């Protein structure tokens, strides 16, 4: 019963291992194993539940263990292991074959098979940790191992894609440990974690690997947002070390999502508005990306309110996420209607929900935007309006208070009007007829560059699938 269970999953694990084993030996095929490793994460997660944990026990016995002797015992000690044929050397799948990692040449140390075996061994260990949700000592014990090993081992172009997915598990398992319980040893692990990301990023710069460097950047930018220090992130994004070539579909929208949050407190909404829009188009529409689309669309609606312009409220309805978008509808309604008491009572009840996404701090500053939008609505209606007519509609304090607030709207060129103190009315200075200026040419010059930018993208992509088929023989 239990004997046939261990041989079934181990044969499928070697079958998938031999596919990427022979491809990395000749030249560089690494593009092909990268596609296989994408599905390997999903196929292994479903397979870990079946046949219990015994699929990874005989896999270490098959190959040679450089560091992994005590790692499997320590990983299986917390679950109160039940020992069945636990003596090492029970299952031998090698039997002296070239693709089987021939033993005599391996035991005599005349050849080194540890490079591809050990780096792949750490991948299967991190998968069971996230599947079984093993925390506390098991998280810190594996961190003391992989990091010193990556410093001694020098990865080639194909080998840099192995640990690229391991850095995500180190940061993911660390954040779940801090939020679960607060202990004195929690931040001691984060200090070394923050210093380790900067040391390995220095080496990956010369490797020119797209997935390796881009995976760390999105993990480093998230750490800066938790501490709330832009000075570390400001110079970090100015170097432009983020590879734009191949992020696949995972890192497309993750990079632009951080720039929208950083520039939100920079008081520049021109560039931040484009980053949040590009994050929506680059993010997949599937169910696994719904967690990202939930937080991203909530940030886009908050940026528009900070710009002074009322966005489209139809997104709060036709979308299927409106259950979580209900608190944000009353915020825009209070800013549009200009009611002072409605905005104060709206943020009071939903303050608990705004604490999770940390958007309540931006909602406090929406108190000013209620007046910013209210002035824009009343100004467009009446070109010449009396000074006391504004205080009657918005129920303001006095005439000296509104005189200061209207002067704040034309600061950046929003309203573009003038205040006449002696005449007693505010007159709009916008005569339209802007076509006589150079403004139409300013937009058309970018459309030509944007059209040729899409041309330059299509300019050079054809031959990539044609390299394999034209070089190989065809019927």
């Amino acid at each position: 019963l239990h004997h046939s269970e261990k041989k079934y999953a181990e044969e499928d694990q070697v079958q998938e291992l031999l596919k990427v084993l022979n491809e990395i030996s000749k030249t560089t095929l690494t593009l092909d194993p990268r596609y296989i490793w994408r599905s390997l994460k999903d196929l292994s997660s479903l397979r870990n539940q079946e046949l219990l944990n015994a699929e990874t026990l005989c896999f270490t016995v098959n190959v040679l263990y450089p560091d992994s002797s005590s790692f499997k015992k320590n990983l299986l000690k917390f679950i109160t292991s039940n020992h069945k044929s636990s003596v090492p050397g029970s299952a031998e799948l090698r039997n002296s074959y070239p693709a089987s990692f021939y033993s005599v040449n391996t035991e005599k140390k005349t050849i080194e098979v540890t490079a591809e075996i050990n780096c792949f061994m750490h991948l299967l260990v991190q998968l069971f940790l996230w599947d079984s949700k093993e925390l506390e000592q098991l998280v810190e014990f594996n961190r003391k191992v992989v990091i010193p090993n990556l410093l001694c081992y020098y990865n080639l172009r194909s080998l840099n894609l192995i640990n690229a997915k391991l850095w995500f598990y180190i940061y993911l398992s660390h954040e779940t440990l801090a939020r679960s319980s607060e202990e004195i040893n929690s931040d001691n692990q984060n200090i070394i974690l923050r210093s380790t990301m900067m040391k390995f990023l220095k080496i990956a710069s010369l490797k020119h690997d797209n997935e390796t460097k881009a995976m760390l950047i999105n993990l480093i930018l998230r750490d800066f947002l938790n501490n709330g220090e832009v000075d570390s992130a400001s110079d970090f994004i100015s170097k432009l070390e983020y590879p734009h070539t191949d992020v696949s579909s995972s890192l497309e929208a993750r990079y632009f999502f951080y720039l929208s949050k950083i520039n939100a407190i920079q008081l520049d909404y021109s560039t931040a508005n484009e980053y949040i829009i590009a994050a929506i188009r680059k993010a997949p529409h599937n169910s696994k990306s719904l967690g990202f689309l939930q937080q991203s669309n909530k940030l886009h609606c908050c940026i528009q309110l900070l710009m002074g312009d009322i966005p489209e409220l139809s997104f709060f309805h036709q979308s299927n996420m409106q259950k979580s978008l209900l608190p944000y509808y009353h915020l825009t309604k209070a800013v549009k209607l200009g009611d002072l008491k409605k905005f104060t009572s709206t943020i009071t009840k939903y303050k608990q929900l705004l604490l999770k996404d940390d958007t309540y701090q931006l909602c406090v500053r929406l108190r000013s935007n209620v007046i910013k939008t209210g002035i824009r609505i009343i100004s467009l209606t009446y070109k010449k309006i009396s000074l006391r007519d504004i205080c009657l509609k918005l129920n303001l304090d006095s005439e000296q208070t509104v005189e200061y607030m209207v002067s704040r709207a034309i600061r950046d060129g929003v309203i573009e009007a003038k205040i006449n103190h002696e005449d007693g009315f505010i007159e709009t200075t916008e005569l339209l007829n802007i076509y006589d200026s150079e403004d139409p040419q300013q937009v058309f010059d970018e459309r030509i560059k944007f059209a040729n930018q899409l041309h330059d993208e299509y300019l050079v992509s054809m031959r990539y699938p044609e390299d394999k088929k034209t070089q190989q023989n065809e019927k």
Partner: peptide, 27 residues
């Protein structure tokens, strides 16, 4: 489509038409 749905309140007809009755009496 749905933006026009919620933005329309109970105002206008039932209200403004009741004001037009007393407006002509004051003139």
């Amino acid at each position: 489509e749905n933006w026009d749905d919620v933005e329309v309140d109970d105002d206008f007809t039932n209200e403004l038409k009741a004001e037009l009755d007393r407006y002509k009496r004051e003139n």
